[PDB]
Amino acid sequence: HTSPLLAPVRQIHAFGDSYSDNGESQRLTREMLAKGIAGAQALPGEVYWQGRWSNGPTAVEVLARQLGAQLADHAVGGAKSGADNYYGWMSAYRHTGLAGQVDAYLATLDGKPVDGQALHFIFVSANDFFEHEDFAGEQPLEQLAGSSVANIRAAVQRLGEAGARRFLVVSSTDLSVVPAVVAGNRVERAQRYLQAVNASLPIQLAALRKTRGLELSWFDHLTFSRHLRRNPARYGLVELDAPCQPTQPSVRPACANPDQYYFWNEWHPTRRVHQLAGEAMAARYAR
């Protein structure tokens, strides 16, 4: 039996990675390129929609639309749970991890209080895993998951400390079915990492929510995706594994029927999946 829906939302502040970013990596990398920052690249690239790391609006944009909320989207493609980004070359210019996004949000309030009615949306961790696997990180995966969890708890704590009261925190996605992970033969490692984060993080957040008197909702993206991928015809999906828009090793022409694909490229879902995700995330709130 379901409990009462949460109160409406009129403003979202979103923090996270390329599953949320609605233009920041594009803005920031154009700035870094203009400045001559060593190793900078234009992100996300040419085969993306309006600076999103997809072919359409991300889940949090859909959430905002669903709830009747304005969105300030601080998320940055490549963001890790800590201070920095998968793209190591960004750190000379800006700390664009979750912790750096929180810092910049709290430093730019311009003597206004944090809005106690704004929903602070947090969706991060995938790049902790991708960085670890692509650059031979030394932590055991269980320890990396522990750091990811601690980093996300610290963000909620620091936002609350400053006056935030309302949160939505997204679980790990199912990294084990990401095409780049399958291609890397890293399905078991992704399974282990994501299960450790998703077991531990909601326990840490329930403790913090009670201690600080927060309204905090947990979105289990793994349950969401498992249901989609077990019953794809119900949602009009046909292709669960092939990217619509191949980019690895090189860019190839996009599929003709992207609204029937799960994945846009080798790491990121399509606008259709983002739409279903945003609608599912909106389910806990009254309009």
TrEMBL record:
Gene: choE
GO MF term list: cholinesterase activity
InterPro entries tied to this protein: GDSL (IPR001087), GDSL_Est/Lipase (IPR051058), SGNH_hydro_sf (IPR036514)
Keyword annotations of the record: Hydrolase, Signal
Species for this entry: Pseudomonas aeruginosa (strain ATCC 15692 / DSM 22644 / CIP 104116 / JCM 14847 / LMG 12228 / 1C / PRS 101 / PAO1)
Disulfide bonds: 244-255
Keyword Cell cycle attributed: no
Keyword Signal carried by entry: yes
Protein name: ChoE
